[PDB]
Every structure is written in structure tokens, then in C-alpha cells.
Amino acid sequence: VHHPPSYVAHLASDFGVRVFQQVAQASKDRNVVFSPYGVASVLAMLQLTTGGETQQQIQAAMGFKIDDKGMAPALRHLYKELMGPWNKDEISTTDAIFVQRDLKLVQGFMPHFFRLFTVKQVDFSEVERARFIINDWVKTHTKGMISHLLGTGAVDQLTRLVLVNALYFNGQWKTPFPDSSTHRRLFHKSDGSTVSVPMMAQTNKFNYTEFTTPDGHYYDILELPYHGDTLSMFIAAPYEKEVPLSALTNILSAQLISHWKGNMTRLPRLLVLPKFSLETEVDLRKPLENLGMTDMFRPFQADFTSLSDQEPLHVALALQKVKIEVNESGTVASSSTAVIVEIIIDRPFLFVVRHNPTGTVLFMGQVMEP
């Protein structure tokens, strides 16, 4: 464990979880898959382009200033840790900034962006080409998983800046579920009704801890490691079907996950887990405004003087796309965030894909219906 990457990863992951809780609030009984590291990555970049109180608001919500001593080195060290070969499991994370070809950038932004995290020349008056350029780049850096990050109406002639992160993960269980154990079983939805889904089964030693909500709701917390022994998926489900999953998501944090992991012991048991493939696209405006980042969305009031004195700029929209597939052999998942300037789990559950040496939360979500 290295301190620098683990420090910034905790802040990053915690900030991401708080954004997730905001999205989960809005879609109480809907499948949500999210990427905390993903949204933290672009907003870390956004700290560089903004100024005054617009920047302050981002800094306060994230818990750190990108420009503070040792802070950027920690973020670079971080994604090096995630992408190292020793992980066995593949992670690819790439940040990018696309700027209007002829936009006059403040002197020193380019060299400052390089040594902390080069820009890519784009012509937004050429709308569809510029949208393709960016969509094509997100596509390769998600290995094809996300082909159209920016829909039609995401950029136009007036667009000047697009910050983007692309995350990819894969994704092999330390011990796979045998294909032949996969069977159909009723899943209990939040509305009481049942649906029949394919579920995976296996008997092994699983890192496990019991957990109790303030309201006394008992939860199973299970850890499913990937073969590299650095990354794992945490699964959290209520002992009884009746308990709403928000009880858990309301109290979630990066610290709690670490505290779970700190208290688990390997126990033998049969684990029945549904397979799932979730796809979510979320508008990040309200969730980000809720965490106090309101100024960046307001025309004229937003402050991007760290990027350009040439003209007033504001955030037109903020968005994230995430995909995740969980099956017998492992997990494949990717996200792209942009800013435009016997334990049977047959009820809804939480999942968290975490890199444990750093505490980085790559993906998390609630499975309301597999």
C-alpha cells in the first residue's frame, strides 16, 4: 500500500459514492450501475479549468485541490497502480480534454495540464465530425463497450470544451461459477412480485461479514475476489426480502466499505447469485448541484477563467454512461463520463467493484431486477 494513491482514491471514491447516492435517490426502484472513479476523474480535471467560487465548490465537494502539493502526483500514481500488470485483471483508464480548434486558451494552461495529467484539436462548428471524433475515442478506450457517449444534441456549433474519462475493467473470478450450476430461480422485486432469472451457484470459502443498519436491518456482505487478488466485487443484500435497499445506500461511504473488508473472514457456504447486465445513462446536473456544485451550470456566473479569458463559459451538460456484465467467468465493465462546456441473493442487492490496495471504487450499483 502506497499512501499517495490510497489517499486520493479514498477521497475520489467517497466523492463518487456520494454522487451515486444522489442518483439512487432519483431512481429508487430502478437498476443503477455507476462509476465513482469515473466521475471523480473528470471533475478532478474540471478543477483545472474553473476558477473563483465555481472551482471552490468542486474542491469542497471532492475534498481536495488538484493543485495542492503532491496531489496530482498521487492521481497519476493512482491510475498506474490500477493499470499495473501485477493486478492480472485488466484496467484501462484514460482521461482526455477536447478543445475548440481556435479557442484562445489562457497562457500556461496547456503546459499546466500536461504536467498534472495534451489537448485534442476539435472543430465544434463541424458538429457531427466533432461528435464522431469524441465518440470514436470513447469507443476504443472502452474496447467497443460504449460506442456513442455523446448523442445528437449533446454538442453543437457553440460547444467549446469537453472533458472526458473512459474506464474499462476485465474481470476474471478467482474461482468461477460452474456453468452447469447455473439455474433459473425466482427473484423478488421491491414491489413484492417475482420474476424468473438465471442464477449462478457455487460452494466455496467466501470473505464474509454480517452487517446491521441503524434501523436494525441485517445484511449479508460478501466478497468475490478476481483472480489477481487485488480487485474484488462486494455484494450486499438484506437477510430479509422486505427491507428496502435504500436503508443501505443511504448510509454508504468509502469508509464503510473499508470497514466491511476489515471485518470479513473466509467462511464456507453455498452462494447463489443472479447473473446480470446493466446499462445506465445518468444526467449529473442535479446530483452535482445537490453536492453544492451549482455555479458551473449557470451562464455568466460560472467561472472558467483558468481556461479562457476569451469568452464566458458554463457547463451545458454533465453525463455518465456505464455498462457492466457479470457472468460465470467474471466481470466486464466500462464507464465514460463527460462534461460539456447458504446465501441466496434473490432480492435486490448492492454491488461494488473495488481495488483494495488503493481503496478505489471503480463501479457500484443496485440490482433491482436482473
Swiss-Prot record:
Transmembrane segment boundaries: none
Post-translational modification remark: Inactivated by proteolytic attack of the urokinase-type (u-PA) and the tissue-type (TPA), cleaving the 369-Arg-|-Met-370 bond.
Keywords attached to this entry: Glycoprotein, Protease inhibitor, Secreted, Serine protease inhibitor, Signal
Tissue expression per record: Expressed in endothelial cells. Found in plasma, platelets, and hepatoma and fibrosarcoma cells.
Primary location recorded for the protein, binned into one broad class: secreted
Gene Ontology molecular function: protease binding; serine-type endopeptidase inhibitor activity; signaling receptor binding
Record-annotated disulphide pairs: none
Any Gene Ontology biological process: positive regulation of interleukin-8 production
Gene Ontology CC annotations of this record: collagen-containing extracellular matrix; extracellular exosome; extracellular region; extracellular space; peptidase inhibitor complex; plasma membrane; platelet alpha granule lumen; serine protease inhibitor complex
Induction: Up-regulated by coagulation factor Xa (F10) in atrial tissues. Up-regulated in atrial tissues by rapid pacing resembling atrial fibrillation.
Compartments reported by the entry: Secreted
Effect ascribed to mutating Q172C: Increased half-life of the active form
Carbohydrate-modified residues: N207, N263, N327
Coiled coil start-end: none
InterPro entries (alphabetical): Serpin_CS, Serpin_dom, Serpin_fam, Serpin_sf, Serpin_sf_1, Serpin_sf_2
Assigned protein family: Belongs to the serpin family.
Subunit structure and binding partners: Forms a heterodimer with TMPRSS7. Interacts with VTN. Binds LRP1B; binding is followed by internalization and degradation. Interacts with PPP1CB. In complex with PLAU/uPA, interacts with PLAUR/uPAR. Interacts with SORL1 and LRP1, either alone or in complex with PLAU; these interactions are abolished in the presence of LRPAP1/RAP. The ternary complex composed of PLAUR-PLAU-PAI1 also interacts with SORL1. Interacts with PLAT/tPA. Also interacts with SORL1, when complexed to PLAT/tPA.
Annotated disorder: Plasminogen activator inhibitor-1 deficiency: A hematologic disorder characterized by increased bleeding after trauma, injury, or surgery. Affected females have menorrhagia. The bleeding defect is due to increased fibrinolysis of fibrin blood clots due to deficiency of plasminogen activator inhibitor-1, which inhibits tissue and urinary activators of plasminogen.
Described function: Serine protease inhibitor. Inhibits TMPRSS7. Is a primary inhibitor of tissue-type plasminogen activator (PLAT) and urokinase-type plasminogen activator (PLAU). As PLAT inhibitor, it is required for fibrinolysis down-regulation and is responsible for the controlled degradation of blood clots. As PLAU inhibitor, it is involved in the regulation of cell adhesion and spreading. Acts as a regulator of cell migration, independently of its role as protease inhibitor. It is required for stimulation of keratinocyte migration during cutaneous injury repair.
Name of the protein this chain belongs to: Plasminogen activator inhibitor 1
Organism: Homo sapiens
